[PDB]
From a paper:
Rhomboids, first discovered as part of the epidermal growth factor signalling pathway in Drosophila, are characterised by a core of six TM helices. Structures of the [name] from [name] and Haemophilus influenzae have revealed that the catalytic dyad serine and histidine forms part of a water-filled cavity separated from the external medium by a flexible loop and from the bilayer by TM helices. Substrate proteins are thought to diffuse laterally through gaps between TM helices to reach the rhomboid active site.
The first one was obtained from a completely delipidated protein for the wild-type (WT) protein in a trigonal crystal form (space group, R32) and diffracted to 1.85 Å. The hydroxyl of Thr201 points away from active-site His254 and is within hydrogen-bonding distance to the side-chain amide of Asn154 and the imidazole nitrogen of His150, both residues being part of the oxyanion hole, thus explaining the inactivity. The mutation of serine to threonine results in a displacement of side chain of the active-site histidine by ∼ 1 Å. Six detergent molecules surround L1 and two occupy the space beneath it, thus preserving the structure of L1. BNG514 observed in the trigonal crystal form occupies the space between TM2/TM5 and protrudes into the active site. Such an insertion of detergent results in minimal structural change involving only a partial displacement of L5 in particular residues (residues 245–247). Glycine and proline are residues that are known to introduce kinks in TM helices, and it is probable that the TM helix of the substrate must bend towards the enzyme thereby juxtaposing the cleavage site of the substrate with the active site of enzyme. This detergent molecule may be mimicking a rhomboid substrate bending towards the active site. A small displacement of L5 lifts the side chains of Phe245 and Met247, but Met249 in the present structure still plugs the cavity near the active site.
Author numbering: 91 to 271
Amino acid sequence: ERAGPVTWVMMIACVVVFIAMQILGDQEVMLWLAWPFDPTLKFEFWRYFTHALMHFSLMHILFNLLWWWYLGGAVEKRLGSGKLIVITLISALLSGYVQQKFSGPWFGGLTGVVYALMGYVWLRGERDPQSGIYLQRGLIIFALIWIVAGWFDLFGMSMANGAHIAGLAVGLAMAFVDSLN
Ligand SMILES: CCCCCCCCCO[C@@H]1O[C@H](CO)[C@@H](O)[C@H](O)[C@H]1O
Ligand SMILES: CCCCCCCCCO[C@@H]1O[C@H](CO)[C@@H](O)[C@H](O)[C@H]1O
Ligand SMILES: CCCCCCCCCO[C@@H]1O[C@H](CO)[C@@H](O)[C@H](O)[C@H]1O
Ligand SMILES: CCCCCCCCCO[C@@H]1O[C@H](CO)[C@@H](O)[C@H](O)[C@H]1O
């Protein structure tokens, strides 16, 4: 098999934006894609979402897209493109919102979305085995190591932990809902 359309297009888009950032510089791209950083930009609606497409180091984009490929790919294949779209939109909005509230509008990346996917896949598997969706034991360990890395700012460039929690909460909430139904 291969990655579905949403999984694939997100990966492509992030790579393209990362290349633009190397060519033009990070700030030049943030000017266009960052969460609104001035009142004159509040109705540029793409900005509530496009922050998720920007990454600020090789490790940032590499591990984000690895988790996205694996977890997003599984969700899309087993549960449909629509499911992945909604998890992605809600988690990007809410984690972005909490991030800007605590730390300002200059941020970006899929880290909040990955937290949501981790929470979703794990909880869905823990509550509802018959879905085909779950987070294997071994990968729980490595997910935790990735979480710890960001939680303790072990690379200096991490989001607010409140933003992490916000993303995780979206994934857990959606999995809870899907496990009831
Ligand atoms: C540190 C991050 C953890 C990385 C875990 C390994 C990721 C391996 C991804 O596998 C790929 O997944 C796609 C959708 O799930 C499939 O379409 C594809 O056939 C399969 O090869
Ligand atoms: C986590 C969510 C992932 C980010 C999704 C960002 C989608 C942004 C789409 O931008 C839109 O592109 C159009 C094409 O021209 C423009 O006409 C329009 O003005 C612009 O708003
Ligand atoms: C520093 C990053 C190191 C990543 C090492 C990944 C270990 C191997 C994981 O493989 C993946 O395991 C999943 C569950 O078995 C399969 O669903 C998937 O298809 C497969 O690709
Ligand atoms: C459903 C949305 C929930 C959002 C919750 C956000 C507020 C949580 C507070 O977290 C604490 O405060 C700081 C957060 O940035 C971190 O310094 C600290 O490590 C963390 O423990």
